[PDB]
Amino acid sequence: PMSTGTFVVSQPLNYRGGARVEPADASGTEKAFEPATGRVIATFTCSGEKEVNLAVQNAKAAFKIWSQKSGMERCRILLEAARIIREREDEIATMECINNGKSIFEARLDIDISWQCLEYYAGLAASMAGEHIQLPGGSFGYTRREPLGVCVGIGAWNYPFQIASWKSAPALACGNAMVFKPSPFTPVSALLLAEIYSEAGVPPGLFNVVQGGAATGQFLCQHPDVAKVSFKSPLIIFSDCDMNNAVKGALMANFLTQGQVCCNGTRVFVQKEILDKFTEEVVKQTQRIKIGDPLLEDTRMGPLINRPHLERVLGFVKVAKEQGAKVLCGGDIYVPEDPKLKDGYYMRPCVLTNCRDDMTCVKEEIFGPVMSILSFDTEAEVLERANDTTFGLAAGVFTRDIQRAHRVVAELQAGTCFINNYNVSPVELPFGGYKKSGFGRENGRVTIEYYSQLKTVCVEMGDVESAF
Amino acid sequence: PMSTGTFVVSQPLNYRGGARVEPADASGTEKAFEPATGRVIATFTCSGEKEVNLAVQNAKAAFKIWSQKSGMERCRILLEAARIIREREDEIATMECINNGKSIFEARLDIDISWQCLEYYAGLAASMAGEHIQLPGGSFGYTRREPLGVCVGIGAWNYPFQIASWKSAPALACGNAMVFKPSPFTPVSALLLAEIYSEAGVPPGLFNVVQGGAATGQFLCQHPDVAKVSFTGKSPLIIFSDCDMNNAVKGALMANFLTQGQVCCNGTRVFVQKEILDKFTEEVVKQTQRIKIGDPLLEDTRMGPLINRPHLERVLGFVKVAKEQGAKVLCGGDIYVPEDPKLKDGYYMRPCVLTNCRDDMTCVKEEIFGPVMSILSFDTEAEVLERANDTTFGLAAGVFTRDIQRAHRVVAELQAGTCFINNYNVSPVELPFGGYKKSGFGRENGRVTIEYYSQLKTVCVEMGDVESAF
Amino acid sequence: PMSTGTFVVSQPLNYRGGARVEPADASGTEKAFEPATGRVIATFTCSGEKEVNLAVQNAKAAFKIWSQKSGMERCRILLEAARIIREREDEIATMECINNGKSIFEARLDIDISWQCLEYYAGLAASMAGEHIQLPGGSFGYTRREPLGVCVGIGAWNYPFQIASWKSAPALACGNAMVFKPSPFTPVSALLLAEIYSEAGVPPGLFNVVQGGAATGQFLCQHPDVAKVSFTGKSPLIIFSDCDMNNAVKGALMANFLTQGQVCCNGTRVFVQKEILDKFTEEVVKQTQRIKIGDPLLEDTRMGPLINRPHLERVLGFVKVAKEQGAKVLCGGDIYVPEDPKLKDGYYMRPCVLTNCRDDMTCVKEEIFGPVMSILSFDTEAEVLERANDTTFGLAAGVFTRDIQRAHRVVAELQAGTCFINNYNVSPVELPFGGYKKSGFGRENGRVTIEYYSQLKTVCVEMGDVESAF
Amino acid sequence: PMSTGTFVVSQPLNYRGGARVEPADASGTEKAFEPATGRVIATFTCSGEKEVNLAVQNAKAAFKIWSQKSGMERCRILLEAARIIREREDEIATMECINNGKSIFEARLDIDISWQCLEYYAGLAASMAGEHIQLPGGSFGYTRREPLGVCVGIGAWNYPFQIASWKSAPALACGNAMVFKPSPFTPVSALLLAEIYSEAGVPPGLFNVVQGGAATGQFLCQHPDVAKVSFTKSPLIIFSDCDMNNAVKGALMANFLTQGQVCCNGTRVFVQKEILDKFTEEVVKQTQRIKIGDPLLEDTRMGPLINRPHLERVLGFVKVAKEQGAKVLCGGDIYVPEDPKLKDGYYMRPCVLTNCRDDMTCVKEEIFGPVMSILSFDTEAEVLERANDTTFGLAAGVFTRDIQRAHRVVAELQAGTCFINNYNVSPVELPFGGYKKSGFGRENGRVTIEYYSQLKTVCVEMGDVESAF
């Protein structure tokens, strides 16, 4: 039923005690947009400290109930929340494109992860166990992972529904309550999750939503009842690679999610030999990318999050030119054929060549559809030039020589490495966010630890053996 | 061998490239003592930034070698270091008492926990494995825990050799290098570990030692080549009227006077139910007055001296104010003069038992870090749980009651991370299962600490063609 | 909509390729009953060699498809099958009672386990991973748990739907196909599971059902394409003088008369201490005489009929001999005729309590599989432990004492696999944590059972040159 | 100090209560040999039932003690036993060759695994923990892995000390006692382990050794106090695009390590039509260079076969292979070493056969000798059909530079252990194809610990019983 250029927020954007609320006090006022049209979908209040307090006080209450429920009881509520998400998928995914701008194509994948995540932690809640050790003389010791209490989740604008799901699913599975503060850019989708949790059977206050910016964030972090607050990538193309897969990989790595992720492999090192053929093919393919209405099934490139952000990306390209880069295609305002999209935050995906490491476009993360093609001669050279990469990053190597691939992956300091592919998936996702992957056992174990604490009990069955 | 009142440091107290070194740069000077005699066992230089740099740079080099060795190779070196520790146990344990002041009795247990810890991580290094996930079309994904690089370990004075062992073992078993900064109170014992690691086959620079205080610590933390820095209401004891009095008294004494009560672990807030209050107090004072104070090297000694004179003066200060606030000193809390004249200038005091304690009292509010027991009276279960729930998760609590339901009910309500039913153990925070003897570490303790000293690398191998969205 | 004395089987009772089928060949013919009425609900064909072959061949086909689907795809199908089970719960629960005889009360708990179990393995299928080990010089090794192929599941009559689900869900989560062979006593309920799996989205043949007895079982075991066949002193209850009498009596009744006492899990050897013997016996008889015997479909019914006429004749046989051997029948152990004339020919009897029992007695020696309690007197802890430790590990035991030390000491000495302190649960063997309600399964139960239905494939990738010994 | 052609057993060959003992009764008598010389190193008594009973009764006692010790204590004893093994390594390896015939080279690697195994299980004993589940109303449930009791371990002659270590190390880490029956071929080495365990601090009767054959094995299995009894063709696909030298190295390793007397050995060598001639030429060249002789010599890579009947059987297989139409390219004949002490040793030259057919018994049956069967093939589809008749308990090795092909072949192959561009002749028990600096990971021990233990479950009720009635 929902379409581009029509949506307007009618209900309030805060959520406490299982219902939408207007904030009790303000830290300011913000406007949320429809990036495809430039339309204001909401003018909303940012939570003040009294408001922040009410939300924390409310979830503190819900925490006390939820923490007393068994893992099995919590598992059913969470599996239900996933069923509702799965059912209302197209509705949710639409709301997501409307406020964020990503393709319905991508937005659905985001929602798939979202319910998959909930099913994962629901499972873990039901199969939770501690350690038990037998001590000499019938005495024994045991452990239990207890929830922390009221956790704060800070959202991002690039994966709004998915970040909300990803933070709250392990949090609530542990028996905690969450107060979630989404990006002021994207305040809508989180309320859909909040509503779904209530519908699933979560006690009122367990997943609360406070809207706001920096001040709000600070008020949440400064709250005494808050237990815990939960808050360039290279692509090496060797001459011996499968050119078409390398080109496909480069495009995926740079233009998925409009290149508005830090995950994106924007530094494209291409070996001297294949440099000319690669560049020619990459420009050809980029010029075919479908820019338009994110709700259209054929659209692969939507608008950028907002006007300031778009201006910044266009600014990057102006400097890129100034510094000596050769704009091969795009990097300019795109005026879509449909007049409703006239004032949307659109631009054409950019491919830059003749890039050097000293260049700010090579140095800084742009957060837009901009590919920087850097030439290289030898394996030893790339590895020196590319190794300045943080562990929180990803790297991708394209070569038919398996030994070279493993050798390069071994030397690269990036946490996630892809041989003969590239996936633009969020950091949290295990196994580079490959589709039929699963989460394995370690991802959950580690994140469960983040949202819980280990209680240790020692039972003495005999007499105390005094040293004195 | 070594005896009390005779030891003096002869070699330098820093350690780089497998040998003892004098610091290149100076950031002041410190004196280390023999707490049993008051003697200066060392006047040493506090490492300067040029020195800190050398130690980090040396470890960075050693890291590059070690990180390339298999878990199996790393395991043999670590199992060897544990064998040497176990063999030189009394030598180590004695060197520990000489500088720290704890009884040889307790010092040995500390050393047992040190070699046990090394054998544990050695085992984990050899049995390390990642995840391997199969993907559609023959493509696959896998994971690897890699070391972080050069890790900094900051020591404490209460468990000097044990803190050094506890930080270094998980670090070195991940393939990391370590630069260790002991407490300038207890500089000596760490060098013994450093020597042992070299002897075991650790590459030169893998476990380096830099002496110093705050400045030295700051230089280590500020160093760009340092990957990670590992650092270091009051603990209650609830005694119900239905408990086994003798075990409760034994437990209270253990909880307050082990390690001279110089740990934050110690259960110093002793809540006693109104009925048993009089009998408990009478028995606890009787038993406390029997505690053997003296030479920590003596096998019969259960109470040694306090770490230093400023620290002793502070504990004596707390007692002075406690009686000013209205507490009743039942025994001790005064300067003790041992029979032994070599022991004359040692930092000794008689273990203290205080009664008529109120929650408003600073002795009940603040952690003293001395042998001082605060006895607080209570009437009901509901009352204690209110009064004693202002306890942090990083603390420990002990409950004494013959009613099993009550015990579990109390343990459930208490916010402490480690709870003991019908006992109390004063073991460091790091130790799983309340540091009970012959316990083991289970699997989770190691898993969690390995995570602290490592990072997860993920690799995705594509067996087919790239599926383009465009 | 379904009721007692009305139901008759209309469709065939074998399942192949997503539909009910009549067996291709016969190994014989059986009659399935309504135990509450004595009615024949179905006269069915036992599967012959050719039919067993067809089900295996059909499952082999389904296996090839399913095994190629990801754990995530298999997880959705299983989570769906659990949703359908949960939704049609009362329909299945009812159908279960009609053929088996257990109370609708107990039948629901069985069905709750069924869908809980499917949700568990669905979770495990989605989170499956192997090990990845790094080797010198960039070479690597990894592992994967692969399904075995076509597995066979053999049913029991005491938990027909539950044991059907318990065997199918793990085998299928591994990516296997299964051929289930229900007890010829209880053929019906399994077909409901088979139908649900189809409805969920399992490929036709993934979970086939072949009816039959021993010959069908033999044909399944002898089949060359069958990868694995999954099959299905007496349990004591020590009641000490210092315990909580009412909980001990409640526990004794639960332990003996749940599932009409037709489980091997049931704690039928009740050791009672000489002192409390008289009070316990008096209370247990009083409570037993209050047990509601009748229509299993009635919500108030706690005791239904026994599985069949031969089965009942056997239990009453054991009672006849028990009094011949010197036992004192305190209540029941006789043919019961319910007030509802429809239940006139059902397989009913009054729950029995026997006293003055000796270890030499066959009622104490043999498992009866009926509502019969054997009360044995004892004087001391040392005595019981001697008399009761002729217990196999595949059994359960229960101890009632207020002395925690005594409880743990007894549990430690007892050779039973599952021990209950101050309670008793009659849950199937498979169930972790004594089948307590809000328990969960933990991680180990699943790990171990996944290993049963899978095999470890190991792959070694050489990145360098082969190092020849020659 | 020990050498070939000198050793003779002087002490008895059973071990009970921390001592070597002569069997109380007999199930027969066997002769043990020095395969390098043909010498009888021992004429010993096979254990009767009274003797088996004594070993079990003694082990039952030691169990009751060992099972009551902490996993922490057990771990120290086991880490000590590994230190002693590691220290007396050369003595043990020497003794192993003397009775078995394998090279000092391989015999050491066997002993390395042996002490590595013990260190692994020692670690697991110390870090053992059960599950603890919280239940509504303060009630709780927990689990513990308990030992089974007296376990029986049946040895093999190909890895005598290693099989003993591999069975005893997990069982003893659990808290069980073990009665071990070595192969009547290889009695000696197991007693060295039994002695080391005692020296380490194991209670007397915790690891007992009863010498014997089938009757003795049967007596052990039939014993009511015995809790559990633990008991003991592989293809190699060479594609034309492979690295020839690594493929040849791999083929030799796969066929002639341990004198080819393992079921692990990749004896069916499928070679592509194109590289067939170059491969065959190189493999024969390399095989003819293998150093046959005194297993105690550091340069020796091929020792003698386990015994005369076994050698005759392998020579028999070669006779029939050429009768069936195979082309003997080298060896497969009685070898007479230059050293006269070795004159009556059970030696033969490693054999390479070509013109093999799938119908041939040498391709069908496991030979247990140094015999390589070279089979030609044209396409990937063909090999995969011909080689798929492989059991999961087997290994397979693929050699190809095409990574896609390698994974594709490994995926289709039914073998449990697959190697890409290598082949390792390691026992079945070993995780990650028995690669040297591999480790054991965590699953191998978990699964084996389960074999030698049982899960005890305890449920503590903190409240009142909720009666259905």
mmCIF file with all atom_site columns, C-alpha atoms in Angstrom, chain C residues 1 3 32 199 235 262 297 372:
data_model
loop_
_atom_site.group_PDB
_atom_site.id
_atom_site.type_symbol
_atom_site.label_atom_id
_atom_site.label_alt_id
_atom_site.label_comp_id
_atom_site.label_asym_id
_atom_site.label_entity_id
_atom_site.label_seq_id
_atom_site.pdbx_PDB_ins_code
_atom_site.Cartn_x
_atom_site.Cartn_y
_atom_site.Cartn_z
_atom_site.occupancy
_atom_site.B_iso_or_equiv
_atom_site.pdbx_formal_charge
_atom_site.auth_seq_id
_atom_site.auth_comp_id
_atom_site.auth_asym_id
_atom_site.auth_atom_id
_atom_site.pdbx_PDB_model_num
ATOM 1 C CA . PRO C 1 1   ? -14.007 -32.657 18.141 1.00 0.00 ? 1   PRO C CA 1
ATOM 2 C CA . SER C 1 3   ? -13.827 -38.329 21.702 1.00 0.00 ? 3   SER C CA 1
ATOM 3 C CA . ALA C 1 32  ? -4.208  -51.393 17.229 1.00 0.00 ? 32  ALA C CA 1
ATOM 4 C CA . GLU C 1 199 ? 3.267   -29.401 5.434  1.00 0.00 ? 199 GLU C CA 1
ATOM 5 C CA . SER C 1 235 ? 15.035  -47.603 39.870 1.00 0.00 ? 235 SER C CA 1
ATOM 6 C CA . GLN C 1 262 ? 4.457   -48.127 32.370 1.00 0.00 ? 262 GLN C CA 1
ATOM 7 C CA . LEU C 1 297 ? -9.491  -37.422 27.349 1.00 0.00 ? 297 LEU C CA 1
ATOM 8 C CA . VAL C 1 372 ? 2.628   -50.981 41.456 1.00 0.00 ? 372 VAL C CA 1
#
